[PDB]
Each structure stands twice: as structure tokens, then as C-alpha cells.
Design a protein around this ligand. Structure first.
Ligand code: NAP
Ligand code: STR
Length: 323
């Protein structure tokens, strides 16, 4: 709304800040950078911090969070920290060890939110993306409902305050929602969402089920090759976003973030730049008109930056369905 500490009530009674700090950085960015950036994010007013085992940064992100708690800047209760279960630990018996491993790296006792990162399961082991000779990904067959049950036990244990999913399509959400003996609905579905891929149908569906849609790559993504097609249009270079930025005396990034806030979406924003980190929290300072929101709706162009198509094949690959 108008305060950078604004939150939304999740379906389990916990509260999530509507603006989150994204912590992923491309492989070529030195791992030391995550520490300072996360500290700066907290100093700027970010409270919701998003990471995952896959991002290989939890040790640094954890260090930053704990440093800010230690110096009195924030209390643990005011930080909303998200981790995610990777595809190599979908087997029910491997779920808790994965969360405990993340917690050990963070040196924290609980996460505020734990997500199933991506619905396609891969063979268990140290390698996050296991491959045979020939370079073919080794997939594993796991019942996602069984995975969910094990995630539910993590909430029972108090290791995760809230639980949810990421990169799930409508069918996959329904599979969890319709599961016999379901204990906890997912609080959220974290998916790619920006003016070029606005997710209207999935957003409406999540809302109908009391599931929050959390937008990742909301500024058009890190554009890291080969995960993102280098020939895809650059979101922040959009002429309409630029024109709206000029009208409001803001920036294209701020317009893209504000768009999500006004349509009921919780939005992430990654930056490792001091000026841009401070800039992003200014999203709460202005409002887009209904006419401008409509103009941004028009930017929709079916550009999905993160296809994760290396995981295409198994029926659980989520992006084949309409939504
Ligand atoms: N669940 C999933 O499967 C998944 C997938 C992708 C992402 N995520 C999460 O979502 C987060 C965000 O997505 P993302 O990493 O793809 O990046 P993003 O938030 O879409 O941002 C992309 C780029 O925008 C730049 N930027 C930030 N603020 C700006 C500003 N005010 N003006 C101009 N440029 C600005 C950043 O560069 P600088 O750093 O140089 O400022 C960044 O590289 C991730 O870090 C991760 O936490 C989750
Ligand atoms: C957050 C980001 O969008 C995710 C989506 C796809 C992910 C990548 C998928 C491929 C991959 C394989 C590895 O072994 C290291 C991590 C990486 C390099 C992943 C890092 C995080 C990525 C880039």
C-alpha cells in the first residue's frame, strides 16, 4: 500500500511482507556479494528475503540476517525468510534432512516459508542436477502428494512456519488441494510474473483457493545464459514502462513492481546494487491509475524467461499446460 512494511495474511494465519528481496545471483557473481547485498536490503527496509538451497548462497544470506539481528537493526520475528526444497530431495524421507541442511547453513532455527521449488523430481544425491554420461538428466519418480506430506511434517515440527510451492501449474495445485487427508494448503505459489507474462489465469486461480501468487523475475529476470534466452526482449527496456516511469518521475523497475502490488501479487526484486536496493523500496511511495494498470496489462506477450526446459519430458514439467 503506502508503507514498506505492509504484509498480507496467509491462509495459515502467518503474515508475509508484500515486497521481497531476491537473493539469487548468476554463477559468475562472486559468492561474497550476497552477504553485503542482503545486509543493504535489510538496512533499506526489506524484511521478506527469498532464497533456496539451489542458489548456493544460504551460508552468506544467513550470515547477513544474523548480523542484522545481532546489531539490533531487526529482530528475528520481523524477518520473513524463505527457503526451498530442491528436486533431488523430493522423496519424503529426504525432505526433512534437506530443510535441516539449509537451516545448518543459515545457522537459523526455522525458516518462515519452505517451498517445493520445482515439481520435477531428479535422482537423490549431492549433485543438484544429476546427469549420466551423454549429459542426460537423471529423473526420479516421486508422488508429489507424498512430498507434500513430508513438507507438512516440517510445519508440524516447527522447522518451517509456513509451507508452499513454486512453479506449480493449476493441475499440480489441484493435486495437492484435492489430496486425501490434506493438513495444510500451500500458502503460496511462487512463479515467474511480470508485464510480459502477467499470469492472469493462474493469479485468479490462486486467489480462488486462498493461495498467494508470489512473483519472481518481476524485473525481467537475471537473464543468465543458458537458463534465459539471450534473444528474448528486455523487460526494463519496454517503451511503455519507460514512459510511465517518466510520467511518475520513477523508473521502469518501480513501475513493474508497483504493477504487481496493485493487482494483489506479492513481488520479489533482486538487486546487489546499493542504489537500486534503496530505490526498490520506494515502490510504496506512489500509485498507478486504473488506466495505467490497463496499459500495463496490454504489455502481456507470452514471454516466459525461465522455461526450465532442461526438465521438459516428465509429465510433471509444469509449463506445457495453458496454466
Ligand atoms: N522460484 C523460482 O524457481 C525462482 C526463479 C527465479 C527467481 N527466483 C527468485 O526471485 C528473485 C528475483 O528474480 P531474478 O533473480 O530473476 O531477478 P529480477 O528481480 O527479475 O531482477 C533482474 C535484474 O534487475 C536488476 N535490477 C534490480 N533493481 C533494479 C532497478 N531498480 N533498476 C534497474 N535494474 C534493476 C538487477 O540487477 P542488479 O543486481 O545489478 O541491480 C537484476 O539482475 C531471485 O533472486 C530469486 O530469489 C525464484
Ligand atoms: C533462480 C534461477 O532462476 C534458477 C532457475 C534455474 C536454475 C539453475 C538450473 C541449472 C543449475 C545447475 C547447477 O548445477 C547449479 C545451479 C543452476 C545454475 C541453477 C541455479 C538457479 C537457477 C538459475
Amino acid at each position: 500500500q503506502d508503507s514498506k512494511y505492509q504484509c498480507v495474511k496467509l491462509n495459515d494465519g502467518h503474515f508475509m511482507p508484500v515486497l521481497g528481496f531476491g537473493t539469487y545471483a548468476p554463477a559468475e557473481v562472486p559468492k561474497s556479494k550476497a552477504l553485503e547485498a542482503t545486509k543493504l536490503a535489510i538496512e533499506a527496509g526489506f524484511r521478506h528475503i527469498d532464497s533456496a538451497h539451489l542458489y548456493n548462497n544460504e551460508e552468506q544470506v544467513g550470515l547477513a540476517i544474523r548480523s542484522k539481528i545481532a546489531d539490533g537493526s531487526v529482530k528475528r520475528e520481523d524477518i520473513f525468510y524463505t527457503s526451498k526444497l530442491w528436486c533431488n530431495s523430493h522423496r519424503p524421507e529426504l525432505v526433512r534432512p534437506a530443510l535441516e541442511r539449509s537451516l545448518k547453513n543459515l545457522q537459523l532455527d526455522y525458516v518462515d516459508l519452505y517451498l517445493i521449488h520445482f515439481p520435477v523430481s531428479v535422482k537423490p544425491g549431492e549433485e543438484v542436477i544429476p546427469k549420466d554420461e551423454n549429459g542426460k538428466i537423471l529423473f526420479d519418480t516421486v508422488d508429489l502428494c507424498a512430498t507434500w506430506e513430508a513438507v507438512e511434517k516440517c510445519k508440524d515440527a516447527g522447522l518451517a512456519k509456513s509451507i508452499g510451492v513454486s512453479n506449480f501449474n493449476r493441475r499440480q495445485l489441484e493435486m495437492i488441494l484435492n489430496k486425501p487427508g490434506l493438513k495444510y494448503k500451500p500458502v503460496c505459489n511462487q512463479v515467474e510474473c511480470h508485464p510480459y507474462f502477467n499470469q492472469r489465469k493462474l493469479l485468479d486461480f490462486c486467489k480462488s483457493k486462498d493461495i498467494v501468487l508470489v512473483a519472481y523475475s518481476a524485473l525481467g529476470s537475471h537473464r543468465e545464459e543458458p537458463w534465459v534466452d539471450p534473444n528474448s526482449p528486455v523487460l526494463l527496456e519496454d517503451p511503455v514502462l519507460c514512459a510511465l516511469a517518466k510520467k511518475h518521475k520513477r523508473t521502469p523497475a518501480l513501475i513493474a513492481l508497483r504493477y504487481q502490488l496493485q493487482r494483489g501479487v506479492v513481488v520479489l526484486a533482486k538487486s546487489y546494487n546499493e542504489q537500486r536496493i534503496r530505490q526498490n523500496v520506494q515502490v510504496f511511495e506512489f500509485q498507478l491509475t486504473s488506466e495505467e494498470m490497463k496499459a500495463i496489462d496490454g504489455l502481456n506477450r507470452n514471454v516466459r524467461y525461465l522455461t526450465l526446459d532442461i526438465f521438459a519430458g516428465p509429465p510433471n514439467y509444469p509449463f506445457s499446460d495453458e496454466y
